[model samples]
Target: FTMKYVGSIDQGTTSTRFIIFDERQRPVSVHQVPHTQHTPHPGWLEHDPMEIFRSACKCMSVAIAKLRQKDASFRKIEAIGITNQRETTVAWDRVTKEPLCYAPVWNDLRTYDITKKVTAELGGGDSMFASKITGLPVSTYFAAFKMRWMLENVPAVADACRRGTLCFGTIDTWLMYKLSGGKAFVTDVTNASRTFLMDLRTRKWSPELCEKLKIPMETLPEIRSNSELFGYVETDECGVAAALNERTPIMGSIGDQQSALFGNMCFEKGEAKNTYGTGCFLLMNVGEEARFSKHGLLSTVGFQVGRDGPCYYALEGAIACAGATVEWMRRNMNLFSHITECEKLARSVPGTQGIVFVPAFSGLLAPYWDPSARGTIVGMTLKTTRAHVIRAALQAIALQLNDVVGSMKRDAGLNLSSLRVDGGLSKNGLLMEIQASLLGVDILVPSMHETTALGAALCAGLAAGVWTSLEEVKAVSRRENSWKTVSPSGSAMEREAMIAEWREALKRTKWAK
Candidate 1:
């Protein structure tokens, strides 16, 4: 009989956002606040847990205020979703419900020594041994490593840990605790997966790892799915309870990347998305089966609809040379005389003939982690011109994307049905068509660029009963936003030969000493 609204909090790398969404899957209103980033020591970035908490509190209050002013009758906020950075670690006191010190931000490099020690201790072809169970390599970016930094060095955290009064939480857990009046301590599977302490198969805390890491299992919050009843807003901090007149339930919780997957509705297996900015992040849903990353990809939770629903697993890969290569052609190497000519030059050539370009300028990352490898081109001839080289550069990007996709297919035992692409390089038409033909699938380009924000609100909307099912959600999505579909148009075969020649060129790239 009235309007339904959902709230989402995006605690990001530099700022925090609180957005409110209404029925047409539109963002009704929003507010953002930035927090302080303190790095007292090198290789470290810290945030005052209190500052972030206050940022969200004020953001939550103001976002609701603007929405109410716009429509006086719009009073009820059905649910709230919390999507945030996954790997950041916070150490606090369970008894006092206060932070012991600042939280270690995700990109902090302070855990290098500890990460190296673990790799050395667990050496012998098992450098990434935890990859099978944790779905993550034993790296410093994970919460387990970040947390150990505090437990081992921070005196206040260690003091609380010995007395069994310590609480270790990521942003979701901490924000939820504060929102619920120091109650309802829970985290979604998405955040838990990045902690490097949760088992991929069971979706529960890994006691085996906790024991080895010397981290107590008691410090963590209970894990739940993305769309479900997490807690209710019971906190009165910053007059938040006043802004929200009714008791609003916090129903949805997810980490940042997983939220994007759901926002784009890449729900089924074989469906993937690549955000092609300066670099790229390609995440493919591998269905219910937990695919262990033998290809240096992260085995992470795609999303879980509800507390008791099935968990979807994904393989996450990265490319460090997508748009960078494009710019290299224009600004650096001068492959093209003009910017627009970049696409035309690639389109002018039917193929690379026999030449293959490996743009591994920063080394081959992801599928092949060869740091010694440098960017190399092979099979060039007198007939090869600037157009051929330019086309080969674009071809090389698709080739790399193909290798990553092939790895996911091999690891998960499935073929790609479709792909969704974004970022600067995705706008290049020739690259997309070539990508479509090679993967033998449709490539969907979203008309809207606000995927992360859209995803954050989707979790809230689904749990709030604003949309009945995924079908209804999809229906609402199509009515509001249009997606430009880029299907496989002209070619392949040629694909096998291109691939064969690529394998040979890769053999000679290891020239680093």
Candidate 2:
């Protein structure tokens, strides 16, 4: 048959799905199986790992059964990709392949006390002591912290740890382990990066971090690229093995957020994307080089196509500096007499040059989570400055974002692609261009807004040879998606100087005392 199809397992908090997509990137068959939400105590939400695995198998059987009826040409899917709600920690035994207890959801506050204890005890008052290695702080949501809580509270898990039969994994590892009928105990780099235990640079389980965090290295799964030979679907649960009709390898696996970046077709460096809403979730692809955040941004593995290919790394930040900062200049500081002047003045200046503004008003977030940090300005030498100051404000917004992108560039040895912007801020031409010049990558404004099913599909398709390269993936979207691109007009020397000055300027922003 000339037609090709791929299946994606999209497992989430309350439901599991198996969606089949044809080569046209269209979903021809779909099935979703909802699962139970178990709550044992206040602020504790868990899921039955067995139930999730069962639901996924059922979804696969039902969806494939449905597809057979509609399309007689659909013999089998080439491969399967697993995109999951990440950081939701799961614990189980290797021999039994059964969860020790119900899995803890990522947001469950059961890790709250352990999170604090790690910060106060292990971190010695600084949550980011290991951020340089793990690219994460001692946060309640990360897998290590969550698993520690599991180990301390569940005797079964603790006993397995002593017995050396315990297996700890985020959602991706657990599902992949189950899907393989205990033949594979592996996780992808994207999911591994989210674990507080995986090192950001080498992209492996951090031995030093494991010992200090009290997570046994033996209990963790082996890490692999996002797209590779993870394992074959040997499990016959719900007739999925027969339903699949061929030995399908689970080749694509990515965490939730990173999967969206791939699904949105952000494959190159400086090629960034943002999901606009109440709070902005932004990820910039910075090629192969890994970037760590001095300012507290999350440095993570963006994607890895195969075992031999260069792994794409990214810097992720959720921002508060968009409309609030722009509008604040108008309402609060009166930087511009009118709303229109904000852009007008920003454009009027050739550059911010020496002046730098730190707009940390409500507190700075990721890559630099500082509450005491305040909005401040420096290096203003009086020049026709209303424009410079106003322009500097816009530049500040871009520079802050640049710090995130720049940190990603520094962390990853690789450079950038283009950047995709969404939301109301996407309309800001002035801010976009400053951002464009800073990273030395074109800035793409305006975008689509979805999840990981296709990301998983693409991974499977590539490995299955449904599509050969990422360029083809981009070409598919390029035809349907339109964009307005902002390119850098400013030179590198000037951009470098602006960044250096911004670094010095950030020093004076601790005004919240």
Candidate 3:
């Protein structure tokens, strides 16, 4: 049997998708299953780990089966790569390999008070000193501070950690452990960066950080590179392991946004991309050295290939709600008959007339870091209709991108001329154009928007020798057929005035407490 493709499980903020990418860096087979977002509290989100895991396995199996039917050699699939949402906390039993509790997703705000406690004790939330040791911020979005909350407040978690029978890992580590039948307890470098456990310089679990967060260091996963074989699938994780030759190596892993950045071919310094998904992610490559941000941005591993690898780094920030706000329109407000329809209706108008939205659903992040903020849409009147609000929603996404990119330019001391964009939401042409116009730059949308999945495949391909080197990978990515540029359709003064109104809306929504 000849392996024909590379498999990537894109465990994302809203869905589980398994994609098969050929040597051309194009997806030949794709399967995705959208999961439910459990909101037990007003500002919190949760997901059943088992549900996601099963969905991923199911999707991978389906995609593989379909590919094998078309080409018998598809059974020869070389490797499996994983890219996932990071720092969504998960703790499971070592012996049983069962989740002690459902993961608090990246969007969960239950840790606001816990984060406040850490801020009072440790000073700045996510600083160079903190991130240098822990590789992440002390924000409620990260795993360490949330882990602290679980260990201190939840008796069960404290007992398990104290007993040393508990294991803690980001979703990547958990998936790797479960897939390996509990043999390997490890995580990729990119995912490790978000755990607030791994040290940036050494890429090892930091004892001082563990002490600071009040988390037991024993539960942390061993740090590993993004493109190495961690382990093979176990009997239960794959039922036909032996028969189907299912021991395909788990060769590569990365955090989703970083994976997309790699997938987008933003290899050089000063390259950047923005992804609009459940939230808006803006990442700027900061070269081989760790560019610690004095501004409100995260310094993290962009991609790490080897122990001797020239470590790529990035400055990242996010808006907690983008597509989630649209989800709100569909599910909560009933304003839209469907999600896509909202976009269609929104585009009917030339723009969001005199309205602005600050989507601080989980508080403003990046360039602001105002966790006390709340979401608000301004410029309302009896004349306003549902379409106006929908346009405002899309405009909200663009404005936040503008805010973060401006901050990036100021901190990096570079006048960025373009942004490479991808993600589910990037499909919206109107939104992309709005994003470009709002920021006054060229937005390049790639031919293949599945850059996150492609990044994972690239990692696995490199490790599995699908292609010889990074140069080969870069060569294949120049297939960008066309791009749409959004410039200032209105005068600069008009754009500035619109942005000023947005700033006013920001002031109204921030400091909600």
**What overall lDDT, based on C-alpha atoms, would model 3 receive against the true structure?**
0.79
Ranking by lDDT: 1, 2, 3
Q: Which stretches of candidate 2 lie over 4 Å from their true place?
A: 277-279, 319-364, 367-418, 421-451, 479-513
- Specify the poorest-scoring 10-residue window by lDDT in model 3: 235-244
| TM-score, predicted candidate 1 vs. hidden true structure | 0.88
lDDT of 2 by residue, 1-513 (tens): 578898999997778888898887778898999999989899999999999999999999999999999998898888999999889989999988899999999868888888888888988899898998987778877999887888898999999999999999998998889998898888999999988999888898989999998998998998888888788899999898999988888888888678778887888776677644333567878777776766667878889888757899888887566567777777887777666777888788787767887777777775677879988888877574778877877777777777666565565555666666665655667877778888777876534423467788888788888888889877766665565678888889888888788888988888877
Cand. 2 Cα-lDDT: 0.81
What tens digits encode model 3's per-residue C-alpha lDDT throughout 1-513? 244588898998789998998777778889998878899879988888878787787787777777767766555568888999887988888987888777889868899888777776676643344754654556777888768777777777788887888888888998888777789998888888887777887777788878877778788888888887888766454342532365688888899999988887777777888888788788888778776666768878889775447678887878779889888888988987755797798987776677777778888887887779987877877878888888888888887888887887776666665688887788887788777678777778887778889888888888888877778787766653344555545567767877888888888886656
Candidate ranking (TM-score, best to worst): 1, 3, 2
Position 98, candidate 1: lDDT: 93
Q: In model 1, which regions exceed 4 Å deviation?
A: 39-42, 69-73, 122-125, 236-239, 323-361, 375-394, 423-431, 497-501, 511-513
Candidate 1 clash figure, as a count: 0
| Each model's total of backbone clashes | 0, 20, 3
